[model samples]
Target: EEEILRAFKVFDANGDGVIDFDEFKFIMQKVGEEPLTDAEVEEAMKEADEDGNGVIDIPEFMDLIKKS
Candidate 1:
């Protein structure tokens, strides 16, 4: 839904179309409301990047949340 898009775009701080591992840290920290270990963040990146392209685009990001 459109609400998901807002959260995704808000995290794309560099104005880039994709979200990086570094940005993933920010998202998880806020969404999870806690500091996740590096291992956990790494796991999440792999889990979300359905295309395995090293970053998450809006589609991948949205897909993850919808699955949650």
Candidate 2:
């Protein structure tokens, strides 16, 4: 959890309590060596964005990591 939190902080560059598409890409790269394409990123974001706000909040992020 500590490393996860650290990764979250690193990706949440603006500290705005959400991971927008740009931030999400950085974290995705950190988690996986191969970079995701735009289509893949959007697909993942859409799947994880439970509230459909087009961003991943803490709960959504946690859910994503947990699933992985």
Candidate 3:
């Protein structure tokens, strides 16, 4: 659980303190992970993409973690 929070902290580049799709993509890229599509990184983001805006916010992120 704590590790997940730390992961978010590491990726939030602009420091708006939110994890957008691009920011999430950047993090996975760092770990050599590829997004399912050319868009959002991490196949998990498809599950996290709560807003349907092709992005995952903090709440959505937390939900993903909980389910995991």
Best by TM-score: 1
Of the two candidates 1 and 3, the one with more favorable lDDT, higher being better, is 1
Task: Report the lDDT tens digits of candidate 1 across residue range 20-54.
Answer: 87777877657546666889888867777887667
TM-score on alpha carbons, each prediction:
0.55, 0.51, 0.52
- Flag regions of model 1 displaced more than 4 Å: 23-36
In TM-score terms, candidate 1 sits at 0.55
Tens digits of per-residue lDDT for model 3 on 1-68?
A: 57766766666657776666666666665656654455445565676677778654466767767765
Output the lDDT of residue 36, model 2.
Answer: 58
* Displacement of the residue 18 alpha carbon in candidate 2, Å: 1.3
Residue 2 error for model 1, in Å?
A: 4.4
TM-score result, candidate 3? 0.52
Error of 2 at 37 (Å): 3.5
